[PDB]
Design an enzyme around this catalytic site. Sequence first.
Site, PDB file in Angstrom:
ATOM      1  N   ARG A  61       0.748  -0.666  -0.127  1.00  0.00           N
ATOM      2  CA  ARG A  61      -0.117   0.022   0.292  1.00  0.00           C
ATOM      3  C   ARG A  61       0.951   1.598   0.197  1.00  0.00           C
ATOM      4  NH1 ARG A  61      -4.887   2.514   2.918  1.00  0.00           N
ATOM      5  NH2 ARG A  61      -3.939   3.487   0.636  1.00  0.00           N
ATOM      6  N   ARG A 104       0.402   1.127  10.694  1.00  0.00           N
ATOM      7  CA  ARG A 104       1.967   0.887  11.263  1.00  0.00           C
ATOM      8  C   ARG A 104       2.286  -0.094  11.948  1.00  0.00           C
ATOM      9  NH1 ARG A 104      -1.273   4.971  11.790  1.00  0.00           N
ATOM     10  NH2 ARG A 104      -1.760   4.272  14.099  1.00  0.00           N
ATOM     11  N   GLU A 150      -1.762  16.931   5.606  1.00  0.00           N
ATOM     12  CA  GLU A 150      -0.834  15.520   4.964  1.00  0.00           C
ATOM     13  C   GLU A 150      -0.448  15.036   3.701  1.00  0.00           C
ATOM     14  OE1 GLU A 150      -0.893  13.708   7.932  1.00  0.00           O
ATOM     15  OE2 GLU A 150      -2.672  14.925   9.086  1.00  0.00           O
ATOM     16  N   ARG A 179      -3.253  17.187   1.374  1.00  0.00           N
ATOM     17  CA  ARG A 179      -4.068  16.381   1.966  1.00  0.00           C
ATOM     18  C   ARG A 179      -4.510  17.002   3.318  1.00  0.00           C
ATOM     19  NH1 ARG A 179      -5.259   9.763   3.825  1.00  0.00           N
ATOM     20  NH2 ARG A 179      -6.982  10.352   5.852  1.00  0.00           N
ATOM     21  N   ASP A 180      -5.936  18.089   3.122  1.00  0.00           N
ATOM     22  CA  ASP A 180      -6.686  18.865   4.715  1.00  0.00           C
ATOM     23  C   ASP A 180      -7.354  17.614   5.237  1.00  0.00           C
ATOM     24  OD1 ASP A 180      -7.240  20.088   6.765  1.00  0.00           O
ATOM     25  OD2 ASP A 180      -7.888  21.711   5.413  1.00  0.00           O
ATOM     26  N   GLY A 209     -10.892  20.152   5.126  1.00  0.00           N
ATOM     27  CA  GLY A 209     -11.281  20.286   3.773  1.00  0.00           C
ATOM     28  C   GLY A 209     -11.327  18.903   2.998  1.00  0.00           C
ATOM     29  N   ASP A 254     -10.171  15.844  -3.129  1.00  0.00           N
ATOM     30  CA  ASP A 254     -10.393  15.164  -2.050  1.00  0.00           C
ATOM     31  C   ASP A 254     -11.923  14.589  -1.935  1.00  0.00           C
ATOM     32  OD1 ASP A 254      -8.751  13.860   0.388  1.00  0.00           O
ATOM     33  OD2 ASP A 254      -8.758  15.548   1.592  1.00  0.00           O
ATOM     34  N   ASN A 269     -11.117  12.861   7.435  1.00  0.00           N
ATOM     35  CA  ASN A 269     -10.816  11.731   6.421  1.00  0.00           C
ATOM     36  C   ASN A 269     -10.296  12.734   5.482  1.00  0.00           C
ATOM     37  OD1 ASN A 269     -10.908   9.290   5.283  1.00  0.00           O
ATOM     38  ND2 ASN A 269     -13.146   9.179   5.451  1.00  0.00           N
ATOM     39  N   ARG A 288     -12.900   5.120  -2.413  1.00  0.00           N
ATOM     40  CA  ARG A 288     -11.821   6.169  -3.385  1.00  0.00           C
ATOM     41  C   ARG A 288     -11.587   4.866  -4.249  1.00  0.00           C
ATOM     42  NH1 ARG A 288      -7.859   5.097   1.539  1.00  0.00           N
ATOM     43  NH2 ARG A 288      -7.742   6.877   2.262  1.00  0.00           N
TER      44      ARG A 288
END
EC number: 3.2.1.18
Lengths: 388, 388, 388, 388
Positions: free
Chosen positions: A37, A71, A196, A212-213, A217, A244, A266, A290
């Site tokens: 990923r 992670r 981000e 990426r907010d 946003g 986004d 998100n 997505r």
Amino acid sequence: RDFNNLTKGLCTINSWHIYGKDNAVRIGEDSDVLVTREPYVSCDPDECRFYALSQGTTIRGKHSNGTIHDRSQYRALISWPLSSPPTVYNSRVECIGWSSTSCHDGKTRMSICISGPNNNASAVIWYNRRPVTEINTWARNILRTQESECVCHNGVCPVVFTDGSATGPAETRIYYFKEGKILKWEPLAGTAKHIEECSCYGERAEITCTCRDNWQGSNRPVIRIDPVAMTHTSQYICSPVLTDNPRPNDPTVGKCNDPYPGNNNNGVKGFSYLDGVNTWLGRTISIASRSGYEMLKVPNALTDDKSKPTQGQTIVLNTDWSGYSGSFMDYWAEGECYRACFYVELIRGRPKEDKVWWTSNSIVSMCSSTEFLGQWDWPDGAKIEYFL
Amino acid sequence: RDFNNLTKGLCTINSWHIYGKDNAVRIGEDSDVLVTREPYVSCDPDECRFYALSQGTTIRGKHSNGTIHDRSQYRALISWPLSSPPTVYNSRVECIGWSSTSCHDGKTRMSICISGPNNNASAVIWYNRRPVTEINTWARNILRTQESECVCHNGVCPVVFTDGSATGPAETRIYYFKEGKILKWEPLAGTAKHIEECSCYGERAEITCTCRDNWQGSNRPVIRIDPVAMTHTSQYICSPVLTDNPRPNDPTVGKCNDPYPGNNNNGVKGFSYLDGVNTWLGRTISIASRSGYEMLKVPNALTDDKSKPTQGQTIVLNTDWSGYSGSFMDYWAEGECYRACFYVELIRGRPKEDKVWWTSNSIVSMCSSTEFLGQWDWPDGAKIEYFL
Amino acid sequence: RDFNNLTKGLCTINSWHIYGKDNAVRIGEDSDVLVTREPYVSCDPDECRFYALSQGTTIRGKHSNGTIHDRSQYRALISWPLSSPPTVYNSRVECIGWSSTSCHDGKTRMSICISGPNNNASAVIWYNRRPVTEINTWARNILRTQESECVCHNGVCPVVFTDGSATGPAETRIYYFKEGKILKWEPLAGTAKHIEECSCYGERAEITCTCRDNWQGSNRPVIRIDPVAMTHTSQYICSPVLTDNPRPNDPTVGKCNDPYPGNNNNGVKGFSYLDGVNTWLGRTISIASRSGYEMLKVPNALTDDKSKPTQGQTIVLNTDWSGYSGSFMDYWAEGECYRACFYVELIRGRPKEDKVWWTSNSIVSMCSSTEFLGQWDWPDGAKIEYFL
Amino acid sequence: RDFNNLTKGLCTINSWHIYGKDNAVRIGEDSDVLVTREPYVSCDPDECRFYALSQGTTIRGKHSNGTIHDRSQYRALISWPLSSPPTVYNSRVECIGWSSTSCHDGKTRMSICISGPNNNASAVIWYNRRPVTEINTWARNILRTQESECVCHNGVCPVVFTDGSATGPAETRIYYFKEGKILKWEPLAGTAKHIEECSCYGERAEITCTCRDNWQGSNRPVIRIDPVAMTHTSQYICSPVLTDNPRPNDPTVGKCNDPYPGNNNNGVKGFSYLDGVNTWLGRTISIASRSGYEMLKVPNALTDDKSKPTQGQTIVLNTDWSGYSGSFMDYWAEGECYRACFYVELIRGRPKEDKVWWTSNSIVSMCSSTEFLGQWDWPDGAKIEYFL
Ligand SMILES: *[C@@H]1O[C@H](CO)[C@@H](O[C@@H]2O[C@H](CO)[C@@H](O[C@@H]3O[C@H](CO[C@H]4O[C@H](CO)[C@@H](O)[C@H](O)[C@@H]4O)[C@@H](O)[C@H](O[C@H]4O[C@H](CO)[C@@H](O)[C@H](O)[C@@H]4O[C@H]4O[C@H](CO)[C@@H](O)[C@H](O)[C@@H]4O[C@H]4O[C@H](CO)[C@@H](O)[C@H](O)[C@@H]4O)[C@@H]3O)[C@H](O)[C@H]2NC(C)=O)[C@H](O)[C@H]1NC(C)=O
Ligand SMILES: *[C@@H]1O[C@H](CO)[C@@H](O[C@@H]2O[C@H](CO)[C@@H](O[C@@H]3O[C@H](CO[C@H]4O[C@H](CO)[C@@H](O)[C@H](O)[C@@H]4O)[C@@H](O)[C@H](O[C@H]4O[C@H](CO)[C@@H](O)[C@H](O)[C@@H]4O[C@H]4O[C@H](CO)[C@@H](O)[C@H](O)[C@@H]4O[C@H]4O[C@H](CO)[C@@H](O)[C@H](O)[C@@H]4O)[C@@H]3O)[C@H](O)[C@H]2NC(C)=O)[C@H](O)[C@H]1NC(C)=O
Ligand SMILES: *[C@@H]1O[C@H](CO)[C@@H](O[C@@H]2O[C@H](CO)[C@@H](O[C@@H]3O[C@H](CO[C@H]4O[C@H](CO)[C@@H](O)[C@H](O)[C@@H]4O)[C@@H](O)[C@H](O[C@H]4O[C@H](CO)[C@@H](O)[C@H](O)[C@@H]4O[C@H]4O[C@H](CO)[C@@H](O)[C@H](O)[C@@H]4O[C@H]4O[C@H](CO)[C@@H](O)[C@H](O)[C@@H]4O)[C@@H]3O)[C@H](O)[C@H]2NC(C)=O)[C@H](O)[C@H]1NC(C)=O
Ligand SMILES: *[C@@H]1O[C@H](CO)[C@@H](O[C@@H]2O[C@H](CO)[C@@H](O[C@@H]3O[C@H](CO[C@H]4O[C@H](CO)[C@@H](O)[C@H](O)[C@@H]4O)[C@@H](O)[C@H](O[C@H]4O[C@H](CO)[C@@H](O)[C@H](O)[C@@H]4O[C@H]4O[C@H](CO)[C@@H](O)[C@H](O)[C@@H]4O[C@H]4O[C@H](CO)[C@@H](O)[C@H](O)[C@@H]4O)[C@@H]3O)[C@H](O)[C@H]2NC(C)=O)[C@H](O)[C@H]1NC(C)=O
Ligand SMILES: *[C@@H]1O[C@H](CO)[C@@H](O[C@@H]2O[C@H](CO)[C@@H](O)[C@H](O)[C@H]2NC(C)=O)[C@H](O)[C@H]1NC(C)=O
Ligand SMILES: *[C@@H]1O[C@H](CO)[C@@H](O[C@@H]2O[C@H](CO)[C@@H](O)[C@H](O)[C@H]2NC(C)=O)[C@H](O)[C@H]1NC(C)=O
Ligand SMILES: CCC(CC)O[C@@H]1C=C(C(=O)O)C[C@H](N)[C@H]1NC(C)=O
Ligand SMILES: CCC(CC)O[C@@H]1C=C(C(=O)O)C[C@H](N)[C@H]1NC(C)=O
Ligand SMILES: CCC(CC)O[C@@H]1C=C(C(=O)O)C[C@H](N)[C@H]1NC(C)=O
Ligand SMILES: CCC(CC)O[C@@H]1C=C(C(=O)O)C[C@H](N)[C@H]1NC(C)=O
Ligand SMILES: *[C@@H]1O[C@H](CO)[C@@H](O)[C@H](O)[C@H]1NC(C)=O
Ligand SMILES: [Ca+2]
Ligand SMILES: [Ca+2]
Ligand SMILES: [Ca+2]
Ligand SMILES: [Ca+2]
Ligand SMILES: [Ca+2]
């Protein structure tokens, strides 16, 4: 040889041609392919390669169970030949970690991997395949970075990091590295309220990052960096064509210095090429998930709060899964301009396809053409039923 | 170093010796071999390699189901070391697409892949492993190309494309590329009435292409190109020894400027070396299907409408499956002449062997010898029963 | 760089140390290893590699059934890194065929593969990875060659071939090649009555070949070649320490110019280093089958018909399967002498272990030491029961 | 180029950052990974790689049964790219044997493998990938060596060997090699009473080895070598912070010249960096088994018999399996100091996890940082249940 300098401007984007596709999940159904990923693409002066965060297991392997998690100590940044799948046998580990970035400066490559527990992560900067510098977490809350290539100019390779909450204000920093050593760092400035996973590219000595907010946003924040003055600015894409995901429906007027509201906490890594009329935005087709992916020419998107599309190209059908997307270019190609390129992460498995216990993806990437090429859709292509 | 120039004439072909064979289907029964079709062979100044259109899946993988289909988004031109099989781990992707060509000009290699839906395909020309030029469909009906290597002379590498119907007149073009850029293109001229999948070779500054008249002819059309004047001509092989498949039985007199009638809307990629008395034609043994394969010396085949064989060599028994065949030569070998070579695609699976759900092939290739060597037959060698 | 010249004499052989072992059958029980036989070892100026005749299938693959057979269209000479197994992914095909030889001349490598039906085989000589010369069968009865490396001196690389009966007088030839081209060939001369699979090595501008008299002799024929005069001689090893297999029990006096009688129409490829007192002979321990393997120091074995062992070293226990064995040396090592080396083919499967339907082998090789090293035995190590 | 010389001193160790991790057992559950043990890490001027003793079988292969055993004829020293797993296809065999060491001298690499039966083993020294020297067993009782990298200075690469009992006094020797040839050897001198598996590193023309007193000591013996005078000394780490395993509980005062008593005839390969206040010791957390792993800063540990920790970092939780550990550094990195590094062998399988019949491991390695980085734990990560 010598440090590469961003001396050219972008080529005119009249359409997008197919660049690479690895069909990883399809092939991996019956071969030793690593679960991954957060992929991307990045070039060296003599070769362009696919990159991603391996999960330290094959897709068919029993350890694939649980790879929806982000992670763990089993992840690593790996690279492999363009359009090949990430196999156990052809993948090269760049560094160990669960968040990364990487870029070639013309002489050699810098790779950055961050690892650790949530409250005690650390980034280690590798240059010329050797560890050179280390940065400890500054906000003790998932130190993280781009997830796509950084860009260099005369040895200076800026990289954007964020540490702290993903659903509130956080501590974002712009680090300016040279030969893996820190020349300087800044706190984020400008009007972007949260950053981000920045997707970046360079042209005419300027680095543009579309991020990426994740907080408020649905429009994307943009960070423009001057790698010579080692300074930057930030704002949002003014356009009402929101990029986004998830997101509200497009309005008739966007916001230039505030997040466009409607969806909180998100988002998805995405990108854009902001170049006046030669401006193209990528986004998932679905405003809810997505799903699907398209490119839209929105002249002056960055600065025109009423800009709407003038041309477009579908990359993935709304009936197919997409995911992350980012920018990269071959700064070492022949010619007078930089050919804009991007990749789309085609996520398969969890959470949308929970009949399997894994989560992985394949990669598709396109580059621009000055021709007006016919379009095709590029799905992952694997049949989940086969993995059951 | 410098662009290669076709300065030599062909070596005398007195027989054919074994050059390469990958036994792909045999080996792939228990190893990670990609499903392919439309293979060929092409040399660089320092290495000769096998090429083909992968189906983006292994033969044993469940996604092998359905690979009889020609054009999907999971195909790609791949190359791998001579006589090895196309495995997931040793195959190098040259570009993405379902029709291709490739050739080295002496300095570097040009690869062309065409992809897209039937009415909106586009070719992208790669040079030095970078995308350089793109050509959009001109007839909106499966833009397609050679499926075997192109040939270069002083930097100029012509390539034959066809767009439009495969069972009627169509729009064939000869493109002259140099460093991946278009120098010029022509419409097909001459008496060939329909062109498909040209097999080419060069000698003494002339490029000869033997193609497939998928419309009406069972004799093969021939395109001779002058890469310096960048002009060409077209006709059919005059000989009554018909070389397309399926085909009527041989007559006593052939046709030089019209398709020899008897079979419509079908054929197979094939080739020939047209060199006066040193003329050899390849063809399937069966007049009905892609079965068996032989080489026949037919002196002056191109220009003598009554030419019949004077010598021959069986390559594959009529009791074994064959398929596509094409030309290539190592323009970088030592010596005073170019040694003619060819490969035969040994198709296994669908449609002839429908007990399995896949379609793939293996490769066998021979080159000429000035000796009069004994002959052997070279079948694929796999037992379909094993795959059940 | 320059052609290598056999300028040194052999190092003193006081014992043998372990050089390489691939444990191919063990590993291949659960990985993609090709089925082989007729292995050997050969060095380039910068690397030493394992070689063998692949059967065009993996050991676990269903096509492994029947690999006891010697000559099919699915075989090929392959090489791979020292001590690795011959896998589908790391094996390099040198040429196509069922009998071969190969050697580096200092500038580049010559590989020879013979293929064809029994009555119409042909050898093709490759030099610098390109086909250069072809030789047609001269006796129409399984044209065959060394099955181990040839040796070169100032560009000249002699190779011994045999064509005709394996159980009667036959037509053996010594070919002198230079850059893959034939400089000259001779018929076998001397007192050797039948030659098969010569094992060769060079020292002080002389090439010594220990072969297999498959017809009548249990003592080994020896061919000494002068690569400058391009002439040779032949005799048998005088010693009563018989080294072919199967064989009678050792006598007290051997034969210098006639086969030592007792066993007809059978044998095994073997070798020896004939160097006065520094003379070592290899042989299977069993006089009945390819079982066990030992090295014996028999001072003056070649010329002393009563020579018996003065020292020895067991390589493989008589309770373990062995097979072919041959010579090779690293002519590009540092030092003042050539370190003698050899390999032993450890055959597994048919005919001795018929519970499985395949026949393959692994490789073990040793080189000499001037020390008097302790000994160990080196079996294949695989448990056939696992393959059932 | 030129022989590397230990001209720098160590960098200040303020913490340890992640360097490499191969997740071998996890991945190997469904891919062709060799079973190993006794791993280490070693660098060349242009690349750093993982090393280990293969068991000549894959983990999933049936021959994995029994790999708890140490010395068989199927073992070999293999190396493979950093952080990749040791697969059948990417592993390079350095030499054949069941005990080894290896180091690059700046110009090329020396690898040493010992093989043989218990009473007749022999070491063979390879230099530039060629066998150069051989040493026969001197005590006829398992001749053995470091199991981690050696270190070189101006061409001289010392290596510590032991021959004789592992539970009594034995014959340890320090060999000084140059280009694979023996310049000199010494018997062990000093106060260390028994030496096994030395872990070494160099700085400012001095080589420091931390070994294993398998006989009586729970404190570690240390051998300091002068590679110019080719002389050495030996003592134990004075510190009460005991670092062998199994071991008694820490006392308040250690022993400088005698083994600290409490546990006999057992231990584990380990290491340390002895550099005044910049002194760090590694040890398993458990005093009873190879469980967990930590690094402790014990200023002046070597010479202060009351030294206790001032800082620390956990590497592996006591609830996870560990094993061997050793030192290595990249002597070819940029900078003014040598960055200390180490690896920990994460053993899985027998004897602790006997539900499976194999024994293998994965590798984790860290290097020092002058930053004070947050810590994470790095377990093997495989679920044994999956292998059942
Ligand atoms: C062979 O190949 C060629 C080359 O690709 C094919 O030709 C291409 O055809 C494409 C598809 O038609 C075309 O793409 C579209 O271009 C439009 C712009 O062109 C038109 O307007 C301009 C400006 O006036 C004119 O100059 C021009 O002449 C045209 O008239 C885009 O506007 C299109 O995008 C919009 O539609 C698609 C669906 O088609 C949406 O998915 C997309 O998001 C856009 O619409 C949404 O967003 C806008 C902006 O806010 C809203 O206004 C609108 O309501 C939609 O909003 C909803 O949907 C989004 C997404 O779901 C959601 O977020 C929001 O909340 C709302 O729900 C489209 O990009 C190419 O430009 C054209 N290429 C070329 C060179 O010609 C050719 O057809 C092929 N041949 C064959 C035979 O197939
Ligand atoms: C060891 O190795 C050597 C080296 O290979 C072997 O020797 C070779 O033997 C080959 C087989 O005999 C031989 O090949 C043949 O050569 C013929 C030409 O030679 C003869 O004619 C010339 C000219 O007069 C003379 O000089 C010469 O001396 C000979 O007499 C070819 O004509 C042969 O091809 C034709 O036959 C084969 C079947 O054998 C067909 O498959 C092939 O298509 C040809 O026949 C068809 O086509 C012709 C032309 O239109 C028609 O006339 C004929 O009716 C056939 O047509 C039907 O079949 C086709 C295909 O199915 C179909 O399309 C059509 O509609 C009809 O149905 C053949 O090529 C080599 O030349 C010879 N090589 C050498 C160096 O000598 C030796 O045997 C081996 N040793 C052993 C012990 O095995
Ligand atoms: C640690 O390592 C070292 C180093 O390896 C070990 O020491 C080695 O020990 C080896 C085994 O003992 C030894 O090898 C033998 O050497 C003999 C020669 O040495 C002796 O004679 C000379 C000459 O007089 C003396 O100088 C010397 O001092 C010794 O006394 C060989 O002759 C031995 O070979 C023969 O025996 C073996 C079985 O041991 C047979 O397999 C072999 O074929 C030889 O015997 C057959 O052939 C001869 C000749 O025709 C016949 O006379 C005899 O009858 C046998 O014939 C039958 O068998 C064959 C084969 O099956 C068949 O074809 C025929 O028809 C008959 O049926 C043997 O090679 C090393 O030299 C010695 N190395 C060194 C450096 O010392 C040490 O032991 C190890 N330590 C431990 C603790 O294990
Ligand atoms: C984010 O990351 C940072 C960076 O890692 C984290 O901060 C680190 O925290 C670590 C854990 O706390 C810490 O490690 C410890 O450091 C101690 C030394 O520091 C303290 O003492 C010094 C000296 O006075 C002071 O300067 C300093 O300010 C501190 O007060 C060590 O002493 C610790 O080791 C001992 O404890 C561990 C258990 O924690 C044992 O496993 C270890 O073996 C040591 O204790 C045994 O051995 C000693 C010596 O003989 C005995 O006295 C003691 O009784 C124990 O003996 C038993 O156990 C052993 C092993 O089982 C056995 O053999 C024996 O027989 C007995 O049974 C420990 O190393 C880092 O230094 C610190 N790093 C930094 C930069 O600050 C931070 O927490 C993270 N953040 C979050 C939120 O998690
Ligand atoms: C093939 O032909 C062209 C000539 O047409 C050769 O090109 C010349 O090469 C030399 C050295 O490269 C230059 O100084 C000339 O100007 C070059 N070109 C032209 C186009 O005039 C080329 O070298 C020939 N190729 C080979 C292998 O000899
Ligand atoms: C092996 O022997 C030949 C001489 O027979 C050497 O060849 C000479 O090499 C030099 C440089 O290559 C030339 O100028 C001579 O003319 C060469 N050859 C002949 C055949 O006379 C060769 O160099 C020797 N090989 C090595 C490694 O030294
Ligand atoms: C942790 C916050 C960060 C940005 C929102 O989240 C990401 C979102 C992800 C996602 O939306 O799919 C995947 C990334 N793997 C993850 N990054 C890390 C370091 O876990
Ligand atoms: C599409 C027309 C073209 C020439 C007749 O057909 C080919 C025939 C084929 C065939 O006869 O086997 C296979 C090729 N894959 C196909 N080419 C494409 C682009 O699909
Ligand atoms: C064919 C005669 C030749 C020498 C006796 O036989 C060999 C014996 C063999 C054997 O004794 O094992 C194996 C070889 N594969 C074979 N060579 C060929 C070309 O088949
Ligand atoms: C043989 C004595 C030696 C040092 C104690 O033992 C080792 C202990 C081992 C261990 O404690 O795990 C593993 C090593 N594989 C072994 N070395 C050899 C050569 O077998
Ligand atoms: C192998 O081949 C033989 C003979 O063809 C056949 O009888 C046998 O059953 C086969 N064995 C296997 C396991 O395929
Ligand atoms: Ca958002
Ligand atoms: Ca036709
Ligand atoms: Ca498998
Ligand atoms: Ca015999
Ligand atoms: Ca101990």
